[PDB]
Amino acid sequence: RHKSDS
Amino acid sequence: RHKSDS
Amino acid sequence: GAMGSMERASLIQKAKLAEQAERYEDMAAFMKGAVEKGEELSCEERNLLSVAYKNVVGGQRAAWRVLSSIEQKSNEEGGPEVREYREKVETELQGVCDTVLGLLDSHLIKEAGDAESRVFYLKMKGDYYRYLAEVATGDDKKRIIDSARSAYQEAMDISKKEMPPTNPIRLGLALNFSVFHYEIANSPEEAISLAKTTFDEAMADLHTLSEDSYKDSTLIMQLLRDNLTLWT
Amino acid sequence: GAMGSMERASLIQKAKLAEQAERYEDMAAFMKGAVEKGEELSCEERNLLSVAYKNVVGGQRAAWRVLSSIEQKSKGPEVREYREKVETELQGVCDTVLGLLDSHLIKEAGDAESRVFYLKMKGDYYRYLAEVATGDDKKRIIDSARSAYQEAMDISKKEMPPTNPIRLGLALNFSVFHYEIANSPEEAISLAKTTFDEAMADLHTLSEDSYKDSTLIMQLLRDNLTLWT
């Protein structure tokens, strides 16, 4: 569910 | 631009 | 071809997986392999084929329109790069249309089958010639326009004799044929008359339709109305 | 290569046209041609390269996740076969990027922004390989990703301020690597907290240009921390 650099 | 069948 | 060693049933399931993954180039290649097995397509399979190639050519058309517009401002309003890349996208678009038209001619358009299948494939032939006409010029464009008209007209003849005026395939065909008249054949009067006749003859019968049929027919009639509003 | 006969400036122009038309496979191919000319990339050109390949690999990763989810909890071989096809294409794109970084872009010279940018990219694309790898290969890939990320971290902590958006995006991705790839939730949580804390302590020294950029990433760090705790 986590996010990386966008 | 016109609508054509989707 | 590349799909020649794969089971037809496995090609159809992989087409459905590709659709789920929104991989429409893959989806089209799987369906092309299925068509090349030589067996007829079911209604569900026809629609997988159409959805796959419509998404592929649709993105190419959209990119071509973006680039042509940039090209048009850089020419009349005010290097070769924009033209070159527009030409690249154009040639790729033509290649996809040629693939679809070849599948239709070699495998799918035939005298056999019910009226729905015969209309569906002839409408598709008319559509992909129309997409070629959108980008063509000169003598080639004239030939393409005649080919589109002939395909659409034969589909119209069948749909008028064999299908009710609310049938979604008949409506979508008339819709697309009217767009051809207006945008491609420079025949706005014929385009308006066709869309209006089609809407009117369909409206007369809407009240007889089940709930589900009502929905399908009105979605397309609304597209006719949209265009009629723009043309009148 | 197919771009060998085209002028560098024309390749950059066409990359920008491809971006406008949302043709990211084309965009990546133009930028690859531009990199292979052998000259350094400007900041603007680095972003073009990264945007193009991130969009290409992003679509492949999303498809792979769709198929891997269908494969799990599910029989014929079709789903595995198509998942393997997508995986092979993804690996090919990562190998292309990593080859470009090694052969052309990663250098001892240049400013910190450029050196950190490319070493972070190296860590990212090894991480994308790790997402789909197994066995001894996956172990090698994990160590390669860690090594690249750590080299980028060592530079960013000596040569950049703690609110720098590149330094922040690097820490964010390295912490994701720690949690998701390396099975090190404690290191992920620690790194994400320390990174957020030190950005917050220095927010007053933030140049307007990099306000949204910095706080956007700080937001991502906090939202990951919500999940890992």
Side-chain angles (χ1 to χ4, degrees), chain A residues 2-6, chain B, chain C residues 1-53 55-71 73-74 78-159 162-188 191-210 212-214 216-221 223-232, chain D residues 1-53 55-71 76-107 109-157 159-185 187-192 194-202 204-207 210-211 214-221 223-229:
Chain A
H2 39 256
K3 284 163 179 151
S4 62
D5 196 12
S6 331
Chain B
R1 235 199 276 126
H2 322 273
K3 307 306 189 54
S4 63
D5 205 28
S6 292
Chain C
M3 302 301 176
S5 69
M6 206 186 303
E7 294 269 17
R8 191 187 186 278
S10 298
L11 288 159
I12 296 293
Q13 151 72 312
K14 287 179 180 173
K16 289 175 182 165
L17 295 170
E19 183 179 32
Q20 288 173 261
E22 298 183 25
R23 300 258 304 198
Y24 294 105
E25 298 73 30
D26 290 346
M27 186 188 178
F30 290 136
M31 289 312 300
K32 176 172 186 283
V35 171
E36 284 164 340
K37 298 303 181 190
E39 310 185 339
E40 282 73 51
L41 302 188
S42 66
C43 181
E44 187 187 6
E45 283 161 350
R46 300 200 313 252
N47 284 308
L48 293 169
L49 176 76
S50 177
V51 165
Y53 278 108
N55 273 277
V56 173
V57 82
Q60 298 175 317
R61 289 164 79 208
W64 185 92
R65 289 194 300 269
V66 168
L67 297 176
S68 180
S69 174
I70 293 170
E71 192 179 2
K73 284 148 197 58
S74 81
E81 288 85 3
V82 179
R83 174 182 54 77
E84 291 170 345
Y85 185 48
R86 189 266 297 159
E87 286 179 358
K88 177 193 172 67
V89 171
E90 190 175 300
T91 300
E92 298 192 355
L93 181 161
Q94 293 169 328
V96 173
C97 292
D98 287 343
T99 293
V100 174
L101 291 166
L103 285 175
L104 291 162
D105 192 77
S106 298
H107 292 289
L108 298 170
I109 295 170
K110 65 210 320 194
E111 296 179 338
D114 64 16
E116 210 145 70
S117 72
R118 281 176 278 120
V119 170
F120 181 95
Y121 293 128
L122 283 159
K123 174 186 165 294
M124 222 176 148
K125 180 170 174 173
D127 289 338
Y128 281 81
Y129 275 122
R130 174 161 58 87
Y131 306 152
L132 288 177
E134 286 179 348
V135 310
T137 59
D139 292 339
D140 184 45
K141 182 179 188 170
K142 292 189 214 293
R143 293 189 291 267
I144 292 165
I145 287 168
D146 285 351
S147 290
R149 190 191 310 281
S150 296
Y152 279 137
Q153 192 65 61
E154 184 179 5
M156 287 291 306
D157 291 341
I158 293 163
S159 68
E162 306 300 328
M163 317 181 103
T166 62
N167 178 279
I169 292 157
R170 176 175 169 173
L171 292 168
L173 164 64
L175 173 63
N176 288 7
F177 197 19
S178 72
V179 170
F180 167 86
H181 284 309
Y182 197 96
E183 182 185 341
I184 304 293
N186 209 5
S187 304
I192 290 154
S193 162
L194 174 58
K196 187 173 202 320
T197 300
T198 302
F199 184 99
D200 288 338
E201 290 172 2
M203 184 59 99
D205 275 300
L206 272 183
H207 52 92
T208 73
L209 298 175
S210 69
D212 294 13
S213 288
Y214 185 81
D216 296 333
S217 296
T218 52
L219 186 86
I220 301 169
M221 293 167 64
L223 301 171
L224 291 155
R225 185 52 65 198
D226 292 340
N227 292 349
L228 283 167
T229 301
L230 279 170
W231 298 341
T232 69
Chain D
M3 303 302 176
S5 68
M6 205 185 304
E7 291 265 13
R8 194 190 183 277
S10 297
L11 290 161
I12 298 298
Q13 294 177 244
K14 289 179 174 168
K16 290 166 169 177
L17 294 169
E19 185 179 31
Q20 293 172 69
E22 300 187 4
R23 302 262 301 200
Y24 294 108
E25 298 73 31
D26 288 352
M27 186 188 184
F30 291 136
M31 289 313 299
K32 175 171 188 283
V35 171
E36 286 166 338
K37 298 300 181 195
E39 306 184 356
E40 302 179 0
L41 304 186
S42 68
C43 182
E44 192 196 358
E45 294 164 344
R46 297 201 284 274
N47 285 336
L48 288 171
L49 176 68
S50 183
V51 166
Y53 277 108
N55 273 274
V56 172
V57 80
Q60 299 169 321
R61 290 165 77 209
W64 188 92
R65 290 183 231 116
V66 163
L67 302 174
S68 188
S69 176
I70 292 172
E71 183 177 8
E78 287 80 7
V79 181
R80 177 184 50 77
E81 290 172 340
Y82 186 43
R83 190 264 296 155
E84 288 174 359
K85 177 197 170 68
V86 171
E87 187 175 302
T88 296
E89 285 178 17
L90 182 150
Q91 293 168 329
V93 176
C94 296
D95 290 336
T96 295
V97 171
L98 292 165
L100 285 180
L101 289 165
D102 188 65
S103 303
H104 290 106
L105 299 166
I106 288 166
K107 295 193 178 311
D111 63 0
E113 301 262 309
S114 76
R115 274 177 290 122
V116 173
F117 182 96
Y118 292 126
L119 283 162
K120 172 185 168 299
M121 199 167 186
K122 179 169 178 178
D124 290 340
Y125 281 83
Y126 274 123
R127 173 161 57 89
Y128 306 150
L129 289 176
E131 287 176 353
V132 311
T134 62
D136 293 340
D137 186 48
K138 179 182 185 176
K139 292 183 193 173
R140 284 187 296 268
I141 296 166
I142 287 166
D143 291 340
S144 297
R146 185 193 313 285
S147 174
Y149 276 137
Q150 193 63 62
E151 182 174 359
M153 291 286 304
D154 291 346
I155 294 161
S156 74
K157 300 206 301 187
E159 303 192 35
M160 290 169 159
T163 69
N164 179 284
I166 302 178
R167 174 175 169 178
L168 285 170
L170 165 63
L172 173 66
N173 285 12
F174 196 18
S175 74
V176 168
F177 167 84
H178 282 317
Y179 191 90
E180 189 190 333
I181 306 299
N183 226 29
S184 299
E187 261 151 44
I189 283 155
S190 179
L191 176 58
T194 299
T195 298
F196 178 85
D197 287 355
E198 290 171 357
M200 190 59 62
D202 250 53
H204 54 290
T205 70
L206 204 50
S207 266
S210 136
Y211 166 77
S214 294
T215 55
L216 236 45
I217 297 173
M218 298 172 74
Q219 203 70 81
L220 301 173
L221 286 160
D223 285 328
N224 288 349
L225 279 164
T226 297
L227 292 170
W228 307 340
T229 58

